[PDB]
């Protein structure tokens, strides 16, 4: 699709909440920016940010109901 | 001494195109761009006379500011940085009798 | 190239380069990562239904 | 066709470094750079319809405007021409 290959090349495409602030960092190491100001519009290096070093949680009632693939994956082996 | 010469090192562009004769503020760029490992900045040895912080900060100024010319329509040629607080008081502008 | 997930032992340059670049480094089963960032493709004609 | 097939050559940039990342524009600038040889243009066959000259001047201008870059201290991203007499009977404006 065009569409999605038209705004991935300007910054901030993404939607979030205002608690992202209170989480994420304005500017990560380098210098380059995240998030900006007028929900707010923030960066996928954002993402990229929270699967880098972001607050974890184990639960175990996230997967409930997602044990129906896992039964195949056990069985594809 | 103005630049201190056995406890130096080099950020190398390696080979540019035998015919790349241009700026030096974008080879600056390049050689910065080869190198992968910044951390969050703090002070190991302070000055004993003056405010470090606001060497901290000029550090993280410069760092941002150069990484900040893609929000520009046209590509400059020099960086003239912003005057602030912490870069007066290093520059010495408010000294003056 | 439309998402901006190159491989993370890969030389292209773009803005999300960096964090990719840290991320990779930080690992240690690299076979675990997501394509979607900086991760290898284990999909074949076996694995099309999971 | 929009593009000729058998008769098009090739200015090239003799192996640009790994981390050369840039704007189409410049490289297209590198590539000019690296011949030597150009000459004063003239017609060889003309076009039996329109004006001839108007594209020695659209041809002459592309060379002049490329050249004329470093008066400019702010120098762009993107190169936009002068709406001149030729360019506009060119195009079809009118």
Redesign the interface.
């Given at each position: 699709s065009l569409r999605m290959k038209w705004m991935m090349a300007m910054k901030y495409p993404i939607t979030a909440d205002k608690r992202i602030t209170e989480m994420v960092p304005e500017?990560n190491?380098?210098?380059?920016?995240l998030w900006s100001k007028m929900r707010v519009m923030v960066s996928p290096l954002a993402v990229t940010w929270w699967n880098r070093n972001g607050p974890m949680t184990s639960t175990v009632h996230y997967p409930k109901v997602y044990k129906t693939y896992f039964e195949k994956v056990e069985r594809l082996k | 001494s103005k630049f201190l010469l056995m406890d130096a090192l080099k950020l190398s562009?390696?080979?540019?195109?035998?015919?790349?004769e241009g700026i030096p503020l974008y080879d600056a760029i390049?050689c910065m761009?080869?190198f992968?490992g910044?951390?969050?900045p703090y002070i190991v040895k302070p000055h004993e006379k003056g405010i470090n912080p606001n060497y901290l900060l000029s550090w993280?100024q410069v760092?941002?500011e150069?990484?900040?010319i893609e929000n520009e329509?046209?590509?400059?040629?020099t960086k003239n940085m912003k005057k602030t607080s912490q870069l007066k008081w290093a520059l010495g502008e408010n000294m003056a009798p | 190239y439309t998402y901006r997930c190159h491989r993370g032992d890969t030389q292209i340059?773009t803005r999300r380069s960096?964090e990719l670049?840290?991320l990779w480094?930080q690992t240690r089963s690299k076979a675990g990562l997501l394509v979607s960032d900086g991760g290898p493709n284990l999909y074949n004609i076996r694995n099309l239904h999971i």
């Amino acid at each position: 699709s065009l569409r999605m290959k038209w705004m991935m090349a300007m910054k901030y495409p993404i939607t979030a909440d205002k608690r992202i602030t209170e989480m994420v960092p304005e500017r990560n190491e380098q210098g380059q920016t995240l998030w900006s100001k007028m929900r707010v519009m923030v960066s996928p290096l954002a993402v990229t940010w929270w699967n880098r070093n972001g607050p974890m949680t184990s639960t175990v009632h996230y997967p409930k109901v997602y044990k129906t693939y896992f039964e195949k994956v056990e069985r594809l082996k | 001494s103005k630049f201190l010469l056995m406890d130096a090192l080099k950020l190398s562009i390696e080979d540019p195109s035998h015919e790349g004769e241009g700026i030096p503020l974008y080879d600056a760029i390049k050689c910065m761009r080869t190198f992968f490992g910044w951390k969050e900045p703090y002070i190991v040895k302070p000055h004993e006379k003056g405010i470090n912080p606001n060497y901290l900060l000029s550090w993280k100024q410069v760092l941002a500011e150069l990484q900040d010319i893609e929000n520009e329509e046209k590509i400059p040629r020099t960086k003239n940085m912003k005057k602030t607080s912490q870069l007066k008081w290093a520059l010495g502008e408010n000294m003056a009798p | 190239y439309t998402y901006r997930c190159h491989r993370g032992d890969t030389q292209i340059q773009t803005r999300r380069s960096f964090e990719l670049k840290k991320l990779w480094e930080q690992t240690r089963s690299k076979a675990g990562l997501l394509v979607s960032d900086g991760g290898p493709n284990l999909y074949n004609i076996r694995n099309l239904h999971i």
